[PDB]
Write a protein that binds this DNA or RNA. Structure first.
Lengths: 178, 56, 132, 260, 143
RNA sequence: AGGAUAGUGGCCUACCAUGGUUUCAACGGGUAACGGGGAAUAAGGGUUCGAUUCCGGAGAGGGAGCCUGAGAAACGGCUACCACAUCCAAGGAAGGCAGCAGGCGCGCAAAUUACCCAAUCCCGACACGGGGAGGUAGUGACAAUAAAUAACGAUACAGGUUGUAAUUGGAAUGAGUACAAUGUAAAUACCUUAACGAGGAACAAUUGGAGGGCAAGUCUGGUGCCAGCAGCCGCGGUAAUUCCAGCUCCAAAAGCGUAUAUUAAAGUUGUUGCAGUUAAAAAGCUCGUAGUUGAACCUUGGGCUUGGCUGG
């Protein structure tokens, strides 16, 4: 029949189940980022590990290898585009120098907090899922939406959102109209 | 052996109705609820930290 | 409310005697723009008959306020009917929907007529004589 | 098994048609014709997937029933007619004349040619052999039989077809330095000049070709098609790239420079 | 040196040698001989339906002193009679003679568990209702 | 040498030789064996799986034989037997779901007797018919993606400029519910969307546990080697950190245990990479064949000219 539609996982549970050293660290990382569960940490961990795995192969190659070049720079350009790699850190060695904290800093939930549109990091996720923040002219309600460098400056309240010049919401209309 | 004693203990356990309690937060809030109580308002006994200390 | 429509990816198709493109709709403060009103609107812009214009495949982007669709305008109403399928002609009212039995009903008849040789009139007449 | 297949699964279609995976289960199966199934293009594919004139497989059929489509100056009424290499497709309603020639990327490039250029074609001589009553003839790549050719014509050569009378206008002899367009392998679509033909009796002969950028590749004689008598003088309007194969890095740099 | 062939033309001697010595491994031997397909009461299955024949109380192995309450079940798939445990305080009462019980393993994978002698299976469902749901009284036995 | 074949060929026949395969594993047996592209797991090397979205093959209850036809030893073609099996007026007649849906049995184990040729393509005398091919919907916690059950203040005690813990609010919003439009062959759904839709915001999150491994109690009550738990070590014989209850807490979260099989763990199958004095394991000892492995040695050095890319 029809050709199969491929799919793949985005996370991986750690081998050792209960280790308070890891258990507290994951709580610490998510707690200050307001992440919903550990899957959002298992997702960052798995997704970052494959970025290293791509870089690890190229460093075994001899330099000026055009696969090591073309693939190496193509990977780096994507990372600097979203800001996880600093603009002065384009050596494919700093890609190994990355940590989970780097890309979680690039999230929509993180950045709306640091742009001050919500008082707290958990209030930052609330502004997202309740459809209030528009990036560019497209409303995004994905907490994990990674923001590129050019998309960094275009995050603001949705124009139809009650906090952004739109009409009042359900509660205000019912009360102000009561 | 004889099968007469099966279920002897649970039968003679006095019934206790669970006390009705407020519901706990779910989602990120329980994630938020724990993060404060474990890393922010510490209740360690000056390096002695127990998670479910029974009364004594 | 201030419905603005944009067009792109225009391809001239004299083989179908039609002009085709992408209907970029800007409809802020509106759920979406209907096919009927778009055809009414599109006809005025391009000075063509409302019956020779086709609009379909309209989906609104996430967050609303903007829709995208496909546009087909033909050089005449007659040209449209030759190259437009029946259902679209029914959608615009330019033709009537075909009235037939269900696919279950049509199929049952066809295997029943496989049980008859010659004219169907002959089959029933011979049935009367045998049962007489 | 009990007979030839008349169906083609979507994944079983030739890769160069660029047919999308999730359009459906089946793909257009080319009919018998001048070109082999795997090395040809159904007309339904061309008018829907490349030119985008037809939005679906139904609209193309009405196009050909109005007699607009001509393959090499003759009408075709088969949606799945196997057009192939150097084939001329004319849609006079649009006033467009086409010649199917490979781009460097290995796929059928949309190549628009002049109205005059649409009145000839080039064919690779497959065999020269004596037919009935002592009449020698020639079989071209598209299976055309031309009787009474120039007695100098032999195998591997390229002739010019007048594409109207079915006769021979001229031909290009196969030799060193001949301009060549490759029609098979991963060197498919490359254009260059012969350097040395290595003969392997009882096997496959290889043609050594230097590209336009002093790039050397070795390919089987079965993929070698002569397009011009010397370097830089092709008998047909070559598509974009002129059979010049680049690196992926150069393509990226050209892409970076082109739009920014 | 190391007692095994190293010469470049000795790939065959290594191929035979390893395959011979995989028979000393019980995991490999049980799989290839198909002892599960032949002698295991489930016939290599994960669970099985069977019919209860009689209920038995068993004296425990040392040093534990208790009674483990199991039953005699005949299997419907192949007609074998093997004992199965009933694990829940007071779940002997939920099962009656001549009930159809869905059995499973003890997780020891064909081995006797704990102090219980001669028993390897446990009851998962009775009359199509989970014995855990009956022990928690989420549902009620169909009868 | 002939016959037969579309054709080669012991494919078959007549005559004549005695050949062919095999420890480099022939032949026989088992297969819970259709093969491959692939899947799972994996630092690497590997191990297990592959009925199954593609390709090749075989089969239509088990055999056998043929008609038509370019193409069939065809089964939604026939004939005959075997085994089942439907009607019968008892003379006879008709069967083949390993197609679609659906019914019985078997099991640990698996969907609606829905709609339609609109999309893909096929077949036909063919711009027009047909298509359970194909597509759409119904059931579906097979798997995978994204992702709700709240947020911020004011009091208030504690507290070190603020993290809260209780009783006090005004907002936001989708879960759902619906005009309508879109969506479609026609619908459902998604998205957009008027109006409705949250204070216990009952619009209530669960699955397992809390001796160790292994995260989270030596808290209270019940039982008293009994009930039972416990993958293993053990816990229970009247203060049980382990059963039976409550409270508290932990891990994961729309997901969490059980069983089975298998992979890693396993350097416990070891080519990489195990061990063999004593823990299992050097044949009693020599000869010896296949196999595996086998001393060194044959134009080096010098001299000149020149092309290319690295550092400056």
């Amino acid at each position: 029949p029809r050709a199969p539609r491929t799919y793949s996982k985005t996370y991986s549970v750690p081998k050792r189940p209960y280790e308070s050293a890891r258990l507290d660290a994951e709580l610490k990382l998510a707690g200050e980022y307001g992440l919903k569960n550990k899957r959002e940490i298992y997702r960052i961990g798995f997704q970052l590990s494959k970025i290293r795995r791509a870089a690890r192969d190229l460093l075994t190659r001899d330099e000026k290898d055009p696969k090591r070049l073309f693939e190496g720079n193509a990977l780096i350009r994507r990372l600097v585009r979203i800001g996880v790699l600093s603009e002065d850190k384009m050596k494919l060695d700093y890609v190994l120098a990355l940590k989970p904290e780097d890309f979680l800093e690039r999230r929509l939930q993180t950045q709306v907090f640091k742009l001050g549109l919500a008082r707290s990091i958990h209030h930052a996720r609330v502004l997202i899922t309740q459809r209030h923040i528009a990036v560019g002219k497209q409303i995004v309600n994905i907490p994990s939406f990674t923001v590129r460098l050019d998309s960094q400056k275009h995050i603001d309240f949705a124009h139809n959102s009650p906090y952004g010049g739109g009409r009042a919401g359900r509660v205000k209309r019912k009360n102000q109209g009561k | 052996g004889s099968l007469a004693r099966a279920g002897k203990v649970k039968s003679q356990t006095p019934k206790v109705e669970k006390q009705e309690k407020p519901k706990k937060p779910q989602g990120r809030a329980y994630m938020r609820l724990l993060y404060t109580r474990r890393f922010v308002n510490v209740t360690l006994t000056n390096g002695k930290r127990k998670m479910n200390p029974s009364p004594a | 409310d201030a419905v603005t429509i944009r067009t792109r990816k225009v391809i001239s198709n004299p083989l179908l005697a039609r002009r085709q493109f992408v209907i970029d709709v800007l409809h802020p403060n509106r759920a979406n723009v209907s096919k009927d009103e778009l055809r009414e609107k599109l006809a005025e812009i391009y000075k063509a008959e409302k019956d020779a214009v086709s609009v379909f495949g309209f989906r609104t982007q996430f967050g609303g306020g903007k829709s995208t669709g496909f546009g087909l305008i033909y050089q005449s109403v007659a040209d449209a009917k030759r190259f437009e399928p029946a259902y679209r002609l029914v959608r615009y009212g330019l033709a009537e929907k075909v009235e037939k039995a269900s696919r279950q009903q049509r199929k049952q008849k066809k295997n029943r007529d496989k049980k008859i040789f010659g004219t169907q009139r002959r089959a029933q007449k011979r049935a009367a004589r045998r049962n007489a | 098994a009990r007979g030839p297949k008349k169906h083609l699964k979507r994944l079983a279609a030739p890769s160069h048609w660029m047919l999308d995976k999730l359009s459906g289960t089946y793909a257009p199966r080319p009919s018998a014709g001048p070109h082999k199934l795997r090395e040809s293009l159904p007309l339904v594919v061309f008018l829907r997937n490349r030119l985008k004139y037809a939005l679906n497989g139904r609209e193309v059929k009405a196009i050909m029933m109005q007699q607009h489509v001509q393959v090499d100056g003759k009408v075709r009424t088969d949606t799945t007619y196997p057009a192939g290499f150097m084939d001329v497709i004319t849609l006079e309603a649009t006033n467009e004349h086409f010649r199917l020639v490979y781009d460097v990327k290995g796929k059928f490039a949309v190549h628009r040619i002049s109205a005059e250029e649409a009145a000839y074609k080039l064919g690779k001589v497959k065999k020269v052999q004596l037919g009935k009553k002592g009449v020698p003839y020639v079989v071209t790549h598209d299976g055309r039989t031309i009787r009474y050719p120039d007695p100098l014509i032999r195998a591997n050569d390229t002739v010019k077809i007048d594409l109207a009378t079915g006769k021979i206008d001229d031909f290009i002899k196969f030799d060193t330095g001949r301009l060549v367009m490759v029609t098979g392998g991963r060197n498919l679509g490359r254009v260059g000049v012969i350097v040395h033909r290595e003969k392997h009796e009882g096997g496959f002969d290889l043609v050594h070709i230097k590209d336009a950028l002093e790039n050397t590749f070795v390919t089987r004689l079965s993929n070698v098609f002569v397009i011009g008598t010397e370097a830089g003088k092709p008998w047909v309007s070559l598509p974009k790239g002129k059979g010049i194969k680049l690196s992926i890095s150069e393509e990226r740099d050209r892409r970076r420079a082109q739009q920014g | 040196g190391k007692g095994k062939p190293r010469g470049l033309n000795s790939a065959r001697k290594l191929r035979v040698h390893r395959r011979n010595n995989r028979w000393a491994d019980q995991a490999y031997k049980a799989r290839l001989l198909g002892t599960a397909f032949k002698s295991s009461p489930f016939g290599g299955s994960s669970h099985a339906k069977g019919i209860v024949l009689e209920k038995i109380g068993i004296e425990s192995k040392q040093p534990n002193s208790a009674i483990r309450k199991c039953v005699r079940v005949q299997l419907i798939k192949n007609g074998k009679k093997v004992t199965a445990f009933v694990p829940n305080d007071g779940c002997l009462n939920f099962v009656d003679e001549n009930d159809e019980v869905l059995l499973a393993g003890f997780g020891r994978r064909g081995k006797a568990k704990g102090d219980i002698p001669g028993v390897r299976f446990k009851v998962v469902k009775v009359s199509g209702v989970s014995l855990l749901a009956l022990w928690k009284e989420k549902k009620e036995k169909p009868r």
